[PDB]
Amino acid sequence: CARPLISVYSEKGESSGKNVTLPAVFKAPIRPDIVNFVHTNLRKNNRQPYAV
């Protein structure tokens, strides 16, 4: 619930005076479990039925 600030870089790899507050998705849980379930099923939608 405590959210730092992240700079906004230029076209040259250099800071600018603007600073954005880090939005709350980057504090959310890290669950490679649920990724590994959802990635396993959403990869399957892609496929064609493949010869019969």
Binding site: P29, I30, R31, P32, D33
Partner: protein, 187 residues
């Protein structure tokens, strides 16, 4: 040879949880530390319930937790339920009671914090009461599953209160021979 005894040697008790949830895997790493190092028996029982499956951790509805906290002498302790706490819209009073659960449901978080109460989890619960001092444990209706009314001696024998399997209720589904006396026998 040795035994004219059998072998029921290996217990069936669950030791590591089958779940791969990282956040549950850190609460286990915290709580397996405590239960061997405190000479406390609360911390045994929570560590069992973190292992336990999702059938055997039924959700507290919100008004069971109230009605088991207003019992006398318990206004001043903090409730701990391992498992989810959901909301009850049957009730109207919500007091300022203390709650410590895994994954309080969202509309239940507001109605606690409207009532000015305090919520915790087990990273926070361990700091206040490592021994579980001052903490009422609860659990939901483990038999309260829909299924457990199917389980009896048989579904027809002295009627046994069974809820038989059927494709849908009505007339013309499991009524004539056995469910009444004129059409044969009456179980």
């Amino acid at each position: 040879g040795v035994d004219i005894r059998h072998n029921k040697d290996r217990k069936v008790r669950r030791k590591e949880p089958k779940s791969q949830d990282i956040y549950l895997r850190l609460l286990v790493k915290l709580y397996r530390f405590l239960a061997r190092r405190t000479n406390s028996t609360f911390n045994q029982v929570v560590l069992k319930r973190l292992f336990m499956s999702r059938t055997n951790r039924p959700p507290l509805s919100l008004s069971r937790m109230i009605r088991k906290m207003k019992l006398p002498g318990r206004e001043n302790k903090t409730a701990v339920v391992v498992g989810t706490i959901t909301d009850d819209v049957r009730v109207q009073e919500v007091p300022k009671l203390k709650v410590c659960a895994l994954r309080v449901t969202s509309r239940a978080r507001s109605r606690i914090l409207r009532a000015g109460g305090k919520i915790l989890t087990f990273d926070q619960l361990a700091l206040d009461s490592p021994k579980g001092c001052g903490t009422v444990l609860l659990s939901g209706p483990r038999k309260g599953r829909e299924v457990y009314r199917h389980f009896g001696k048989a579904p027809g024998t002295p009627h046994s209160h069974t809820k038989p399997y059927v494709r849908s209720k009505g007339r013309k589904f499991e009524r004539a021979r056995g469910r009444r006396a004129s059409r044969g026998y009456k179980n």
